């Protein structure tokens, strides 16, 4: 309810939240995924991502 409780957080690592943990650490923004990489490297198989080469 306080008047001043937000910084101008338009960009940077702050505004950029993860889709699972909400981390600001190692965020694959690419393709509009927005995931912290570690989690992706576990869920990727369901996200349709595979490794071949």
């Amino acid at each position: 309810e306080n008047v001043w409780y937000s910084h101008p957080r338009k960009f940077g690592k702050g505004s950029r939240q993860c889709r699972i943990s909400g981390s600001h650490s190692g965020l694959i923004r690419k393709y509009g995924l927005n995931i912290d990489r570690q989690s992706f490297r576990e869920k990727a198989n369901d996200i349709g991502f595979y490794k071949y080469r």
Partner: protein
């Protein structure tokens, strides 16, 4: 609605993953295993597989409807555009996820671990 095709596909995949995770979390008692998404024009079918299908169903439109509503809320789509079906899995023994869930349940209640395995 409508983005770059690649991007769209990626988003769909992500959505699927999210849904799967939710079902693992929400339908834990329900003995859930897999989700089978079918996206057609208007009516998007979502098939869900579980051991305890009755629980998922409820008493005719109980939990399933709630889940549908939740899904709608999550992803902006309206009533009727998302349909949910709960099915029997054809022999759970081959299915790893189901087995894992069963094992977990056995562990949590109070039983011999090695013997259970």
């Amino acid at each position: 609605a409508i983005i770059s095709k690649k991007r769209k596909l990626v988003a769909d995949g992500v959505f699927y993953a999210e849904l799967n995770e939710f079902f693992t979390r929400e339908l834990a008692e329900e003995g859930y295993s897999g989700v089978e998404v079918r996206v057609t024009p208007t009516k998007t079918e979502i098939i869900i597989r579980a051991t305890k299908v009755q629980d998922v169903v409820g008493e005719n439109g109980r939990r399933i409807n709630e889940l549908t509503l939740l899904i709608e809320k999550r992803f902006k789509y309206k009533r009727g555009t998302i349909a949910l079906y709960a099915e029997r899995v054809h022999d759970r023994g081959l299915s790893a996820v189901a087995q894992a869930e069963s094992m977990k349940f056995k562990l949590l209640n109070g039983l011999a671990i090695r013997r259970a395995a």
